[PDB]
Design a protein around this ligand. Structure first.
Ligand SMILES: [Mg+2]
Ligand SMILES: [Mg+2]
Ligand SMILES: [Mg+2]
Ligand SMILES: [Mg+2]
Ligand SMILES: [Mg+2]
Ligand SMILES: [Mg+2]
Ligand SMILES: [Mg+2]
Ligand SMILES: [Mg+2]
Ligand SMILES: [Mg+2]
Ligand SMILES: [Mg+2]
Ligand SMILES: [Mg+2]
Ligand SMILES: [Mg+2]
Ligand SMILES: [Mg+2]
Ligand SMILES: [Mg+2]
Ligand SMILES: [Mg+2]
Ligand SMILES: [Mg+2]
Ligand SMILES: [Mg+2]
Ligand SMILES: [Mg+2]
Ligand SMILES: [Mg+2]
Ligand SMILES: [Mg+2]
Ligand SMILES: [Mg+2]
Lengths: 134, 169, 182, 260
RNA sequence: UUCAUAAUAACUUUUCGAAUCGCAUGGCCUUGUGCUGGCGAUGGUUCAUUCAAAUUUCUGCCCUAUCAACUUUCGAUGGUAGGAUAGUGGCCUACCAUGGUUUCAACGGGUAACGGGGAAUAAGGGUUCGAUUCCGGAGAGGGAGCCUGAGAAACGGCUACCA
RNA sequence: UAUCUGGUUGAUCCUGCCAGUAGUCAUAUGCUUGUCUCAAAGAUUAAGCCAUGCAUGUCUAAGUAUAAGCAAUUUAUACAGUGAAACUGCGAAUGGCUCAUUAAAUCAGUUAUCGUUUAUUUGAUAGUUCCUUUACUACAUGGAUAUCUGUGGUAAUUCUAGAG
């Protein structure tokens, strides 16, 4: 019917990053879109990498469905893939966790409220408690 | 009153705006190199004060509640080895690893021993780092003495070649 | 402050607005080769005029000396690939006489019509805009695409969509459901 | 204004980075070091735009932190170290050593050099002077100062450098009929022989330099770097080998060579 | 070159010449805990180099004679000496000379003038525009003065006066 | 991608101007406005004024740690795991904005510094500190100051005075 005819152009092997970095030319004959979780399965079986170590991005299909030109990495290992790759890519795949944090402006407000004080906050709290009588 | 601190050496019982650099008190400078004109009160006492500080040097008759009855011990103490050597009065021969206020703090059920981060010693690693540096100082001096001798020799080797070429006509 | 991405007001108006015979002559062109705007014509005329302008500024110098020879040849090479210029004429002085009509007959607009497929010309523009027609194995919905003469033969209906015969035409999904109901 | 400049804006980025007009307001300022701002090559450009061992600056930064990268023996962790002309960049993972040498166009090139020869770096002069303790010393336009040189290592004359130790293997004199590589703008990265040396009092020493093809050209001395005596240049040079063809000649070679 | 550099003579409120730090725990026994030694960090001297920095050479600006003289008491031009500066210097000071520029537009005024790269126009020659993505220069309400610092006459530094 | 027409006349040919004509990463506005890529955007007038918030801070095996901090457990009988705070270091002179000045000034190319400073940069490198030479700190000199412990002020403030 379609068969998700994956290809793997420009395999630049890289001991410095512990990976094969490359483009993923892909196809859809009558299917529409390839999707990434489906790709890393097809990259796991092809490179003997397992879904864990494969990391693919970019793509954006041509036009008239037709084709999609990714940018697939295949690391040497899973532990290798964790310590090099930027966090956001590890979130995409479900390997690492999404880092739950405060908003940007709140971080800056917290930075400056902290800049405003000097030393330890235990001193200013005891003084604030003493001013309740005043 | 109002709340400007009575800076010493200033004189007068009056309020005075005054320029204060780093190197004195009365200004915690928020730039590494910076002067600034903070206000300041003089040194002499007048009616406008709320507060004077008074070092109760020598004792008297009535000990008041817990100002001269109770005793708050020292939080910090000797860090350096020469400081621990003065405080206790031990001299060099007593050797090292103890005279320190370890604290037995508890999270809840577990109870274990704290310690400081004491500095300065004739440590084995300290000694060897000095000997290493002393070796480098010597070995670098030898190498350049050797290299200087080689080019003292090489210049002489050229000098003989100049003299052979010159003497002819 | 990355950099100003440059552009051109590429396609530029004539220096009067109402030369009656030009107003007709432009209509004739927009009718023959099916062009929605005057723009589509001036586009070609300018795009062409740029070439002409090179040819003049090369023919000022002696063909035998370098740029004249090299840039001129490359200019010709470019035209013969794009397929405007003939294979009879590759002589630079012939580039000077290229005209707008020859440029338009090379567009994907027309090379649909010239290879059959559409019938009645405009239909192509409609087919092209309506996501049929694939020159490579790659759909093109610009009518004014300029066909590469080499790639002319490869113009066919798309792998996807009707006419190629993958899926028939979007009122079938209506009447296949309606006929199944009866 | 108010002292030295810390950024370098990408359009101002010297062209032989071949830095990309878009994809960044800034360029990596080549940091201070042995080679001049525009004559250098910062490693980000080298490892990313050229070799593509990194897909971005982050990965270059880490690549330098793990630390197989060794520009001229020593390691570097500096993303924008001035890895200039002649600078032997050895990546121990992959064993892909690179000498830094100009492509005939002008823009630097990846030359995938031997184990082996990438072990000495050729280097110019500069000075001849003497320092304290009456020590005579030599300096290389291409960075280093080397002590106690042979008395007849003169000025604008090359010197092979042991690199790992940093001493003197050997030297090539500057004179008539000696293979000379070029490092000046328009004639940059050409190669030739030397015919004349117009002396010129004050206003720059010129050098008339015929290539293999015997198309003559002139440069200044400062932009000239004596690679050897004719026939045997001491460095392995890239495909092209300092010829610099004509425009039509390059167009001819491209559209002739079509091997699918 | 009065250069690099080397000498003879000294000084000097005698600078610098590591009472600094993290990993590694090897080598000889005169069997002490002896003497010894690796991989690094920072620091520190002038010479180099780089990032630069100040000057400075030449040539080049928009309009105005309804600006033909201007500068030189209160540095103008030159000189000698110092003073200062990182350093050159009328940069400052003393004493001396009377220069200096000008119809090949000095000086003055104007500019709804930041300079350049460039922009639009588009046969050729041109005109007008350039506050504005790059490069210089300035400015941080004005005008001053300065601390720290390699680098500031900083202003998301300070001192002041005006507004 | 060198292009001209209408207008003084009773009409003619000129001088001539006005008017049109085309274009402006040239401003404004008037309608109208479905999509794709791209994308300037308080310069012009006031270099006029500014609430609020933000835009410069930074620690590693590796300068200073008895936080009466967190650790907690199978290196501490001087120290060694993390580390708030603080001093030291370095940075804050970069970037950003703007165009008021400013007309041989700036600025462009061109030289020059044999006329200078240059943290950083990567290269270089200091047996001579001794002061008569028969018993001398060197296997390590001194007391401070901060953060801290509290003692506080004020109507206010990224104000900090005293002692340990
Ligand atoms: Mg489709
Ligand atoms: Mg600080
Ligand atoms: Mg600035
Ligand atoms: Mg010279
Ligand atoms: Mg001298
Ligand atoms: Mg110095
Ligand atoms: Mg003088
Ligand atoms: Mg102005
Ligand atoms: Mg102008
Ligand atoms: Mg401008
Ligand atoms: Mg303005
Ligand atoms: Mg600017
Ligand atoms: Mg304002
Ligand atoms: Mg100021
Ligand atoms: Mg600022
Ligand atoms: Mg400001
Ligand atoms: Mg004309
Ligand atoms: Mg009349
Ligand atoms: Mg009439
Ligand atoms: Mg008009
Ligand atoms: Mg400590």
């Amino acid at each position: 019917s379609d068969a998700i005819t994956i290809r793997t152009r420009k395999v630049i092997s890289n001991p410095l990053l512990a990976r094969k970095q490359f483009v993923v030319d892909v196809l859809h004959p009558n299917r529409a879109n390839v999707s990434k979780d489906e790709l890393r399965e097809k990259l796991a079986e092809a490179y003997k990498a397992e879904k864990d170590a494969v990391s693919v991005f970019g793509f954006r299909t041509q036009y008239g469905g037709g084709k999609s030109t990714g940018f697939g990495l295949v690391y040497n290992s899973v532990a290798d893939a964790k310590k090099f790759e930027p966090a956001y890519r590890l979130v995409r795949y479900g390997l690492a966790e999404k880092v739950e944090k405060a908003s940007r402006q709140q971080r800056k407000q917290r930075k400056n409220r902290g800049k405003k004080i000097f030393g330890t906050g235990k001193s200013i709290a005891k003084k604030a408690a003493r001013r309740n009588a005043d | 009153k109002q709340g400007f601190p009575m800076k010493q050496g200033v004189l007068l019982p009056t309020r005075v705006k005054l320029l204060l650099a780093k190197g004195h008190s009365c200004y915690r400078p928020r730039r590494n190199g910076e002067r600034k004109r903070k206000s300041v009160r003089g040194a002499i006492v007048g009616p406008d004060l709320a507060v004077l500080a008074l070092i109760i040097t020598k004792k008297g008759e009535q000990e008041i509640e817990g100002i001269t009855n109770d005793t708050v011990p020292k939080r910090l103490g000797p860090k350096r080895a020469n400081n621990i050597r003065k405080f206790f009065g031990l001299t060099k021969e007593d050797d090292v690893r103890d005279y320190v206020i370890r604290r037995e703090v508890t999270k809840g059920d577990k109870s274990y021993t704290k310690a400081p981060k004491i500095q300065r010693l004739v440590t084995p690693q300290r000694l060897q780092r000095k000997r290493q540096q002393k070796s480098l100082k010597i070995k670098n001096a030898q190498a350049q003495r050797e290299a200087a001798a080689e080019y003292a020799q090489l210049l002489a080797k050229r000098l003989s070649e100049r003299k052979a070429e010159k003497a002819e006509v | 402050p990355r950099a100003p991405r440059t552009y051109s007001k590429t396609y530029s108006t004539p220096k009067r607005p109402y030369e009656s015979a030009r107003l007709d002559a432009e209509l004739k062109l927009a009718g023959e080769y099916g062009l929605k705007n005057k723009r589509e014509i001036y586009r070609i005329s300018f795009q062409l005029s740029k070439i002409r302008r090179a040819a003049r500024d090369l023919l000022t110098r002696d063909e035998k000396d370098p740029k004249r020879l090299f840039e001129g040849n490359a200019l010709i090479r470019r035209l013969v690939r794009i397929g405007v210029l003939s294979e009879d004429k590759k002589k630079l002085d012939y580039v000077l006489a290229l005209k707008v009509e020859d440029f338009l007959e090379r567009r994907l607009q027309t090379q649909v019509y010239k290879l059959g497929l559409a019938k009645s010309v405009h239909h192509a523009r409609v087919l092209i805009s309506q996501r049929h027609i694939a020159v490579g194995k790659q759909i093109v919905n610009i009518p004014s695409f300029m066909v590469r003469l080499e790639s002319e033969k490869h113009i066919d209906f798309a792998r996807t969509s009707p006419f190629g015969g993958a899926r028939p035409g979007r009122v079938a999904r209506k009447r296949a459901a309606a006929a199944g109901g009866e | 204004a108010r002292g030295p400049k810390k950024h370098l804006k990408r359009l101002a980025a010297p062209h032989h980075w071949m830095l990309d007009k878009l994809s960044g307001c800034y360029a990596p300022r080549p940091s201070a070091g042995p080679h001049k701002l525009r004559e250098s090559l910062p490693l980000i450009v080298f490892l990313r735009n050229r070799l593509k061992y990194a897909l971005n600056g982050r990965e270059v930064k880490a690549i330098l932190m793990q630390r197989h990268v060794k520009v001229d023996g020593k390691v570097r962790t500096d993303t924008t170290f001035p890895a200039g002309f002649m600078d032997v960049i050895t990546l121990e993972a992959t064993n892909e050593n690179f000498r830094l040498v100009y492509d005939v166009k002008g823009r630097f090139a990846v030359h995938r050099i031997t184990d082996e020869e990438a072990s000495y770096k050729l280097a110019k002069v500069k000075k001849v002077q003497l320092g304290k303790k009456g020590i005579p010393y030599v300096v290389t336009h291409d960075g280093r100062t080397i002590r106690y040189p042979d008395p007849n290592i003169k000025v604008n004359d090359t010197v092979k450098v042991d690199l790992a130790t940093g001493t003197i293997t050997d030297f090539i004199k500057f004179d008539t009929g000696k293979l000379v590589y070029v490092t000046g703008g328009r004639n940059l990265g050409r190669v030739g022989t030397i015919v004349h040396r117009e002396r010129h009092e004050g206003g720059f020493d010129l050098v008339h330099i015929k290539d293999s093809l015997e198309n003559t050209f002139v440069t200044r001395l400062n932009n000239v770097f004596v690679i050897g005596e004719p026939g045997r240049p001491w460095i392995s040079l890239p495909k092209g080998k300092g010829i610099k063809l004509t425009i039509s000649e390059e167009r001819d070679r491209r559209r002739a060579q079509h091997g699918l």
